[PDB]
Design an enzyme around this catalytic site. Sequence first.
Site: not given
Ligand code: GTP
Ligand code: MG
Lengths: 49, 430, 430, 442, 269, 150
Positions: D70, D143-144, D205, D10, D253, D178
Amino acid sequence: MDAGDARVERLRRVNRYKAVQAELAREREEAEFQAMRERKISAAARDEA
Amino acid sequence: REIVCVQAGQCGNQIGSKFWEVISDEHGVDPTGTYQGDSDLQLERINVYFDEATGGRYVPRSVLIDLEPGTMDSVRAGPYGQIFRPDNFIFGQSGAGNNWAKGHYTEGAELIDSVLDVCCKEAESCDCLQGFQICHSLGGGTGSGMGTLLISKLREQYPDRIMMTFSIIPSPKVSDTVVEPYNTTLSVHQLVENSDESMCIDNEALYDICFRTLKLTTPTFGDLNHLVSAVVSGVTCCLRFPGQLNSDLRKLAVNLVPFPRLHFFMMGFAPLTSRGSQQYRGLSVPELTQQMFDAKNMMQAADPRHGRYLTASALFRGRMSTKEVDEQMLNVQNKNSSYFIEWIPNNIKSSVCDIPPKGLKMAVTFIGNNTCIQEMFRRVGEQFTLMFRRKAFLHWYTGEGMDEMEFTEAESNMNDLVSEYQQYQDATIE
Amino acid sequence: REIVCVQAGQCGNQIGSKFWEVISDEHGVDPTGTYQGDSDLQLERINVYFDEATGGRYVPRSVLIDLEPGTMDSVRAGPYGQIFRPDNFIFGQSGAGNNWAKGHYTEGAELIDSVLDVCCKEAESCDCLQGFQICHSLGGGTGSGMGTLLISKLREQYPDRIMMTFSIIPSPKVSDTVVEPYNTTLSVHQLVENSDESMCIDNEALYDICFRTLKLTTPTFGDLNHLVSAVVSGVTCCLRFPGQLNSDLRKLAVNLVPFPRLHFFMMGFAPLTSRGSQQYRGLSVPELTQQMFDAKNMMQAADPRHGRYLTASALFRGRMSTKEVDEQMLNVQNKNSSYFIEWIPNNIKSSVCDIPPKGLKMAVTFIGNNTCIQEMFRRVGEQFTLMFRRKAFLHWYTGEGMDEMEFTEAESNMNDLVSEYQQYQDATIE
Amino acid sequence: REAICIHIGQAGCQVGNACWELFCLEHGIQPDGAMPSDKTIGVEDDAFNTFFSETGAGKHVPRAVFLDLEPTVVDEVRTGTYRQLFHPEQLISGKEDAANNYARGHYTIGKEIVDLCLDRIRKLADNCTGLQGFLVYHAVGGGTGSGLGALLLERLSVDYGKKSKLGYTVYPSPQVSTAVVEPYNSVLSTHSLLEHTDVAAMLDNEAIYDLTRRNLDIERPTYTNLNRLIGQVVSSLTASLRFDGALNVDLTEFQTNLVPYPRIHFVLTSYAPVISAEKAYHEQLSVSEISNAVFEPASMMTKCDPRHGKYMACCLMYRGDVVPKDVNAAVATIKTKRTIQFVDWSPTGFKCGINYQPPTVVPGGDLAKVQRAVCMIANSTAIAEVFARIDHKFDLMYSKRAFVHWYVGEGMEEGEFSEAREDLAALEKDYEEVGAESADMD
Amino acid sequence: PRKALLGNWFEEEAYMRDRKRLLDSCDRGVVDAARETQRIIAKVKHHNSAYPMAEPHEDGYLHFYAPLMLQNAATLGFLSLDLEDRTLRPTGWHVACSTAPAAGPALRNCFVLVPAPTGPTDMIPAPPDEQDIVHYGQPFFIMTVPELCDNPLSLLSEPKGPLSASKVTGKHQDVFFSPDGASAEAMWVADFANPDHREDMRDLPIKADAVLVIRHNHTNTPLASSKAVFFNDFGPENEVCCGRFVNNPGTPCGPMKDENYWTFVHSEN
Amino acid sequence: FRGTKTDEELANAKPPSCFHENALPELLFYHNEITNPPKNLLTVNELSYTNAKGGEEVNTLHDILHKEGVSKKRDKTIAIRRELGFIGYGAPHEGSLLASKGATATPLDYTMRCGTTTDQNFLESTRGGCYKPPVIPAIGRMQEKQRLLT
Ligand SMILES: Nc1nc2c(ncn2[C@@H]2O[C@H](COP(=O)(O)OP(=O)(O)OP(=O)(O)O)[C@@H](O)[C@H]2O)c(=O)[nH]1
Ligand SMILES: [Mg+2]
Ligand SMILES: Nc1nc2c(ncn2[C@@H]2O[C@H](COP(=O)(O)OP(=O)(O)O)[C@@H](O)[C@H]2O)c(=O)[nH]1
Ligand SMILES: Nc1nc2c(ncn2[C@@H]2O[C@H](COP(=O)(O)OP(=O)(O)O)[C@@H](O)[C@H]2O)c(=O)[nH]1
């Protein structure tokens, strides 16, 4: 062969373009400065008269 | 008496572009390659650096090698770039990565045969071959590794000729690359065995030249490469113009090198002065000599006042009296007698050439063999031992394939070079 | 002294069309047949390849034969097609089927009489007849089978003239046809007894010429057929223009064929160089001779360095000194003496012709009789034995009518010629 | 020349949207893949090739894959404005998420999807002639991203071998959080990442929130702001491949200068002229001012303080109107400072790069327009503090098996927790040993 | 301006004034950007000067020795040349040519026709009163106006090969202007528009406004202008080459599309 | 993530690349008048040993050490200049004075008709400016004539 020649031609044209634009910018700055000075002198003379 | 040039790496190709501009200007070669000069004196020695192609035109006897074509595309795109023979640009497909072992052992052997084929074609085309001339940096990746590889191959194939190098070495104050000590140490180890005479330049010294002498507010690498191209084209001037006392690379070598390991030299070029001041002081032999010995005008960071001169050479260009040259060299030797090694009765060679560089009435280039060069190597060896004790970054070199024994050999050879300079510095008649 | 041309099969008709374009260009003949040249030297030997038709016109002395008219209809419909005499196009109604036995025995005898009638009319029309010239591929079907049939008939009927062939041979890397070994073996068996001199070209070598020397990004058969047409028209150039040291096809054969069975030669042509680089290097005899002997410029996959030269020939075009030619051929023979057969005191013949190809100052064509050609035949024999041991496609040939004994005879005959080269390669002065 | 970007989950897809927005606007490719002709210069330029390939009709398509379990976020990309830019095969989506379970991504669900991803990456690598590395964007908190990112990096490392892999990774922030299970997923991810990554770039973040509140004047930031900052950083680092400059820097490099030992590959990142448009015209922004800025901890994009450690290597990228003499004077002044310290075995601490193209301005963006910028990535022992705090939180939950039944049910041996914890303990000791100075004799 | 006098103001003021004097005074050849830009502007101004074209003849036929333009049926542009896109070749000087829109007659697009002395060995000669009229199947030269430059130029072509290709597409023959003339490579022959009546109209006079196909006599390849576009000092211009353009690549010999057709343009009555 | 609309916004999104102008070599080394440097191409031996009896002047030592000029001998430069004038690069244009016996470049009908009707006033009007058209020689005909000789 064609790609390298195209690259070389683009580099030479863009370098020439940058040089010309820099020279014109400098000349325009100088001209604006001189025009400002002249108009201010004229204004002072008119007010006194 | 023909010179073959080799240009290696980014720095080498960049310095080369300005050098070949200066040489083409001095012989009146148009940037299209056509001869357009106005006296036979220009034409009669053009062969030294140019080969003649049909209907007027001349092409320059130089080989350009690099691992990524970006610099070569920039030089081909430059204002004089067309003069270079297309077949003389040799390139690979991936960079040196600042690693000596890659440049020497892995990507090197694939190209080196094609480079040797071009160098052999150029050497065997000459009716009589003079030494090779190579410009490269020691701190880089392809410059150090492939330059020293090619030097070793050319020394195998032409052991009776001269090998001359101009080389850029890391400044004492700021590094441009983290792994500089390894590349410098291995390259100096290769050079001290293979080379006959090597000149060293620090970029920090060129910055100090620009800021202090020329008072430039915002110097650029184009200025540094013009200063270097000026001195490099000046050392060879007596090969290619008439004069009252001719000189040759072998004659410089015979007078400069007392012992075969002592072949590292300092460089200087005298007529430097800012555009505002230049209207106030005419050129003369005392002024050139005074600037010539001022450490401000020397292009390396070590200063002569901490060492002693073994030998020096001065090449003068222009119409001038021999008496003033001879008496100036006598006066400098007599007044500063403690700074000259005493078991040689006369340390300076002079040479005089009739034809100055365009727009100067007179010029001199200075070559000096001074023991203060030992301080740079000592600094490199300290930083190398600091890095090596912890084997810093060593896995890159070992993964390419190098044996650790090369590092201990190169360290030992530099330490012996420093020791040899220090012992001759403190030698006495007894 | 007039030559009669025969073009057979797709490859032969395609190469022939480009050849007759090149020849019509060199003598300034419009595709309408009108002479438009600007010197008598062009006109004065036009008879060698053209017959004169009434009120101005010239017709090219060539017979076109093929088994399916598609190629012939394309060339007749092409831009130069009109020049050809209509009665000279011979075609059947069914294909060769890419099969040698079919091409030789079943559809062959139906056409062969009409081809012999046209060839005899052309031969008997000459006031004095020089040799025949045949173009065909050995890997095809009608080219190999019907070409060798026609060669056999012409050798029975005209045993005192010369028989010359240009032949395409299968590449070592990629096949264009599955049954290539049978057609090649049977055709080489026929040529070994019938031919006087045979030249062989690999398409892979033309690709390597185009990519490495000329650096073409996307070559096409027009380029390959231009290279071939250039060399073919170059070998005969001294027949049809003046020169300081004249030469002839029979004189070439007598000076290149030591023993009788050895009549297969490799070809090369020297002034190949890319359009960007050509402005940078003038022509001279050392440059042509050095490129001319470089295996990079040779049109077969076997390399001379694995064999020895038993004889050679160089044909030079242009106004040049004989001293430079003679001393170059001596210098090359002396410096590379291990690659030249010892029993012959001088292996190279030279010839000099005044008139170069348009737009070149100088040119040379090279013909060489080298023993490394044995490596190609051994490889073909291995692939043949692999196919024959398993009866891989034999029912086609036996159904056409061949006795199996022909295959064992052809294999034995070729195995003998390879051994003969092996014996002459390793022979000694004793 | 070319580089391929891999975006996972995500965070990685959302950061990808900002990155490709930036790369399009900087090269000039329209949102539908076209590129307007230029009438002032006679022929076009190859610079897109690092990130785009052209079709025979001249449409551009980008060298990227988007991987998620997803559908929803990728379907948002599919239905948005850049619909026509991407090839539909490049946007790969499964049916259902890994539910914050590393085990579900790695063992159960990712094993079915991974071979399609490898086939797409292979099809990309076949359409190259000078590929020089992989760039990977993912978050280790979910997770993913953790499980499939690890599995895919393992497969890439077997198939392609020596080719370089540079990661930009979003780690769990030190007090903003989170999800509950973040420590387990981050530990298990980091275990795989140790063996199979060449350089790892660290982001938090909380640091980018601090940076957007302090320097910019934004009270209520959202992920699009953070992603635009990340896109600017990646564009600064990759500009050295794509535009003319005095001192270029190839991706190899970085690895040569920054990594002393093969495990010591985690680096801190910072960016200098984060400034608003209203502030930017009241102040000069000279080289020495931005060089002084990059060393203050208020400039960093990871929540760590470098004064508690020692620097091993720094790589400084300047883009825009800069002169080498000013870079040298700035670096010499920095070297003079007493609060900046290097390990005594690394005397020549700096690598420089200088590129002429100034940073691009994005129509909706919040950064000012500026003539020059500098970006730094640096390796420092201070990073050890991030792992120690994640490891302590892992120890707190694992002492009671707080959630382990999920992981054991989805396919994992209990032993894998202890193995990973011992590997992270060894990584902590590595950072202890490498940072010990032997400057005192006897 | 002058700015504040802190630091190195004196030396930099001197340096700037000396640089200005150098740039204003010296020529420096092609290195100077401003001078070469000015000379390109003067180039463009000179090439586009108007020319007094001739009016159509009363008889309505095509005549020799009269200024004319060449227009293509597909591009709707006029044939033009650029004297400075020239490179030296082993066969001589080659000057590139193209087709471009224009506002009228100009020094870059006005040509004359000059007859050749030899026909194709089956010609029926024209009567003495039709010497000036151009007939089908009769070779002729295309030449530039004498006011353009000292040495007249001619339209030439060369056979295709490894070292010869078209300017842009590189798939056809090359057409260029050269001071070479009165040679076998400069002869052109016109034919009829309708394919079935082509050989019935041979050796007959040509009407003033006929659409016709121009062929290279020495290679038998028609002249054409494609839709490929390249930029130069004048703007965007098309490509000119010799080749046969057909609808189906599988049958190269067949009907020819509109870009093999040309026309001759006179002055308005 | 609303996309761009017009080409002008996409163009103004990129700032132009900065350009550093390298200092001219005349600004670093030249010592005389920058707009007119003297030419020094004289040797001491040529300037000392003259033919005084023949008529050429003699030079004092101060004159030898302080004279500007170019050496008198220019035979090879003259030959090269003539050759390039024939080729086409020569400014003096040594060629075009006469044509070879069998190297014609223009049909005689062009010279008789449509070649004698030039307007000198129109040509002078169109040549007026800082651009002059080049003169391109017929080198192809010349080398074609040389090619067909024995
Ligand atoms: N900087 C930044 N952080 C993000 C962003 N989207 C999600 N995060 C952070 O990344 C973490 C969540 O990871 P996700 O990417 O939602 O996890 P996932 O890969 O979807 O894994 P699943 O939930 O099992 O599908 C949290 O700490 C969020 O704050 C984004 O667009 N920018
Ligand atoms: Mg996800
Ligand atoms: N004097 C000078 N130094 C240069 C130039 N270009 C690069 N350098 C220096 O050379 C070193 C970089 O080496 P480089 O040529 O890139 O090595 P390479 O990658 O192997 O070619 C740095 O110290 C640069 O400052 C130049 O034009 N002049
Ligand atoms: N060099 C060259 N080779 C050709 C050409 N046409 C066909 N060939 C080759 O000749 C072989 C095919 O033989 P082909 O002429 O078709 O035999 P045919 O069917 O009996 O006429 C293959 O190796 C082709 O690559 C050509 O125009 N030039």
